[PDB]
Amino acid sequence: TTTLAFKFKDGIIVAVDSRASMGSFISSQNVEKIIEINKNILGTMAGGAADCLYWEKYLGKIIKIYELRNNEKISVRAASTILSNILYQYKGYGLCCGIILSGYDHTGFNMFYVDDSGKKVEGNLFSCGSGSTYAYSILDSAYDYNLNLDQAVELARNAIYHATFRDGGSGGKVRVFHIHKNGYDKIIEGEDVFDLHYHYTNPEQKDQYVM
């Protein structure tokens, strides 16, 4: 459930894992936790997979209707408000969705955090999931504005790696996308964390890594 997204000079970086658990058992190791809501807006998944997916796609449909109607791209703030209102309509019903809506609109680059309890917040650095705390700790420690794209992707990959390292519910593959003015690009579609660990912490394959 580890999600990650931060804003820097050349746009926004979004990162996710690929694990899915039915308790103590992992149902699937490869899932897509990033959805192309619009040509310039992405949204991560945290918590209830089905609720998040269905409501993200419903929001995409609503955005399509509005954009086709008024003939102008919607803003990230408007999408966040719509999603928050719809989720709040189902308060006290069991939804456990946590979303990070990130995109570029006519105002610039924007990021928002939304929760099943209608918790709309605006910021430049967010992370939700079981491993969110570790990602936050490794971001704040080394995060900095105005760093090149390569450094941004490396930092995101390292944060996701460490989050998966100390989280049973986080793992699988790390997907890292980059959002810029004209749409987005998939820097890393999927990377097995196996070689990632054996390259970051235990470069020498001798003896167990004791922590």
Binding site: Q205, K206, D207, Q208
Partner: protein
Amino acid sequence: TTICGLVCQNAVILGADTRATEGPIVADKNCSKLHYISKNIWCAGAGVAGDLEHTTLWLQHNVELHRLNTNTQPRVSMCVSRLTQELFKYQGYKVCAIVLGGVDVNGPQLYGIHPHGSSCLLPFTALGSGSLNAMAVLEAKYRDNMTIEEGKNLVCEAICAGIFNDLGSGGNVDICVITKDSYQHIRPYKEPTIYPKGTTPILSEKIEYIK
């Protein structure tokens, strides 16, 4: 689990399955339900396996000590008495329903012991998840003063049907014949990719020679 017991012409016959479950999964496919108390007394139980094993061992050793001190053939009624007091002392929290068959000076006989400490003498009985089916067939075909061969055939009919019907019971069929002198234990009565060397990766190894 399916346990059955029957009294035949100056003899006793016990039968059981050979499958133990750890929930919806089968742990051991060739377990052994029949247990040896003395040279002329046997038991077979259903319930918590640990409780059954411990109680059976305690009863066997106590009976052996009593026989050695008294120098008389063990009596099944004594074994009943002991089990009944032991279970009643523990408020029935040691759930282990047992079928006890023996041949003492008073002739062959069968006792059913229930978790709460109550006991009842019977000519034929069955316990376990598959007890209903085995007892149904037993009552359908059972007769008094049968022959050992007919008794064993009916004991299969019981246990074999219980295996084929109930999910919690399965595997092979174990049978035991108790007589005033000597006994028989037919354990399996009926019974109805290599990887290339070096495939797995390792990062440490150490050989210690045993003295």
